[PDB]
Amino acid sequence: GLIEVERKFLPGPGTEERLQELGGTLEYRVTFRDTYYDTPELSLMQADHWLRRREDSGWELKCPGAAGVLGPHTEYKELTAEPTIVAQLCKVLRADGLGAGDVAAVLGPLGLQEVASFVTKRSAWKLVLPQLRVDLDTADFGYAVGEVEALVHEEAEVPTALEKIHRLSSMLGVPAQETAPAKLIVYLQRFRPQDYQRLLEVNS
């Protein structure tokens, strides 16, 4: 139950320089491979849940922290304990008690399948005020996207995190009303358009 509060944006030529000028430091660069999973009907995505396997690492379910109330794609609790990931997968897909301690065992009984696997290179920036993060991601299919991010522990901490993230974003030059899609979504646009389209359709 670590809570990610986030705002994606398309980085510009001056993004990194502005981050430096604000006292930000580049903490690490990292390449990782992620495989995303869903049912044929895309039940998780439609529920704004995001299941992936970080290759060589472990599983993660992103669970929306304020569905309905907040605008979408703003707040996620990141589940990494597999017994909890399973419990929650069964909850959203409406399967019963499976008796499952692990996701791999749960994949077939729940009708979950691989929908994407791709490599990302990340530059991870921190701002040391108690801290904000700015990840700059370039996926292996050419899409560059950024994310201003706060990690909190309490849902009570979320309104403040939002304000902080909104304010950092302005200072980086991101128009109040700009949005940018997740890497996964540009992946579907490019390689599985029929899935991208069904997601825009059913979301109307």
Side-chain angles (χ1 to χ4, degrees), residues 13-195:
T15 304
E16 274 174 325
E17 187 169 303
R18 275 172 168 101
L19 273 164
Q20 292 234 310
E21 290 179 332
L22 287 171
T25 76
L26 175 52
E27 198 176 1
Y28 59 85
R29 301 177 81 181
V30 70
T31 309
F32 55 93
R33 184 185 303 251
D34 276 352
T35 304
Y36 301 77
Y37 290 81
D38 211 345
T39 66
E41 303 90 12
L42 315 166
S43 309
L44 293 177
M45 295 196 212
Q46 284 189 68
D48 189 23
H49 283 72
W50 313 89
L51 181 60
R52 59 162 190 237
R53 196 204 213 289
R54 183 144 297 155
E55 307 292 342
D56 289 354
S57 211
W59 284 95
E60 168 161 313
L61 186 55
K62 293 181 178 200
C63 278
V69 174
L70 295 187
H73 335 299
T74 279
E75 187 223 333
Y76 295 94
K77 315 171 283 177
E78 302 170 346
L79 310 166
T80 66
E82 291 190 31
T84 310
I85 289 175
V86 173
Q88 180 72 2
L89 286 179
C90 292
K91 154 149 189 131
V92 292
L93 302 174
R94 269 76 90 143
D96 63 345
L98 288 179
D102 69 294
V103 180
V106 123
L107 288 181
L110 291 166
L112 290 168
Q113 31 177 275
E114 181 180 316
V115 289
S117 187
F118 62 84
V119 179
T120 301
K121 306 185 188 218
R122 167 171 296 169
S123 279
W125 285 81
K126 71 166 172 184
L127 188 51
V128 208
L129 317 188
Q131 68 175 69
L132 289 154
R133 286 170 160 98
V134 182
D135 289 339
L136 304 163
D137 288 0
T138 293
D140 68 17
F141 49 88
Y143 174 58
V145 59
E147 192 179 302
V148 191
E149 212 203 6
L151 305 183
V152 297
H153 293 78
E154 297 286 53
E155 293 226 310
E157 288 181 290
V158 167
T160 286
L162 264 161
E163 208 103 51
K164 272 150 75 142
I165 278 158
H166 288 173
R167 277 196 204 105
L168 188 45
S169 297
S170 70
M171 283 197 280
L172 297 175
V174 193
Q177 271 178 303
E178 193 270 4
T179 64
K183 301 184 302 297
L184 171 67
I185 303 293
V186 186
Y187 184 98
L188 304 165
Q189 291 168 0
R190 283 271 294 278
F191 298 126
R192 294 183 62 127
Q194 290 83 357
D195 280 335

